[PDB]
Every structure is written in structure tokens, then in C-alpha cells.
Amino acid sequence: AQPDVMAELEQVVAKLDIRRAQVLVEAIIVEIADGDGLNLGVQWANTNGGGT
Amino acid sequence: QFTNAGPGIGSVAIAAKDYKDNGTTTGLAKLAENFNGMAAGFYQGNWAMLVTA
Numbered sequence: 001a002q003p004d005v006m007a008e009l010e011q012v013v014a015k016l017d018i019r020r021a022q023v024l025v026e027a028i029i030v031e032i033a034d035g036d037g038l039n040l041g042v043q044w045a046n047t048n049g050g051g052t
Numbered sequence: 053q054f055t056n057a058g059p060g061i062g063s064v065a066i067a068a069k070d071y072k073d074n075g076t077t078t079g080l081a082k083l084a085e086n087f088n089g090m091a092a093g094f095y096q097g098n099w100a101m102l103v104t105a
Contacts, residue, residue: 049094050102052090
């Protein structure tokens with residue numbers, strides 16, 4: 001381009017070529033799980049009387 | 053005989069007569085698979101009674 005644009009492109013480039021900063025990203029995924037089943041049940045079977 | 057009840061006296065009686073002299077248990081064991089409650093039989097002389105709950 002014209003020397004006028006060369007000097008304009010030279011500032012654009014210098015701004016645009018800036019050392020892009022780096023990012024360290026730690027994620028922390030914590031899960032905790034449990035639970036309590038209970039099955040208690042009583043059956044009475046009698047020949048004479050009846051069964052449950 | 054009714055149906056709302058877990059099992060029918062039919063399958064029970066037949067199974068008990070089929071379980072005699074070391075018979076099978078498949079038939080009867082399949083009836084009693086999902087049953088849940090108090091099946092109480094009573095014999096006063098000749099009238100048989102089956103209560104389901």
C-alpha cells in the first residue's frame with residue numbers, strides 16, 4: 001500500500017501482534033452419593049388358621 | 053370365588069392335590085409368585101373359608 005497506509009498498517013500489526021496472555025484453568029468437580037434401603041417384613045403361615 | 057383377591061381357590065386346591073405323593077411345584081409356585089397379604093383358611097365341619105387381606 002501507499003507509504004501513508006504502510007505506516008497505518010504498521011500500527012495495526014503492532015497492536016494486533018501483542019503477546020496474547022495465557023490462562024491456567026483448573027476445574028474442580030466434586031460429587032458425593034449414598035443412601036439407605038431397608039426391607040424388613042414378617043410373614044406368619046399357619047396350616048389351621050391361615051398364612052400372610 | 054372372586055378375583056380382586058391375590059389368588060383363586062382353584063389353582064390352590066389343584067396345586068395341593070398335584071403336590072401330593074411327591075408331585076410338581078411349578079404350577080403352584082407360579083400362583084404364589086406375586087401374592088401379598090394374609091390368606092387365612094378355616095375348616096368348621098364341612099364349610100371351608102378363605103380370608104384374603
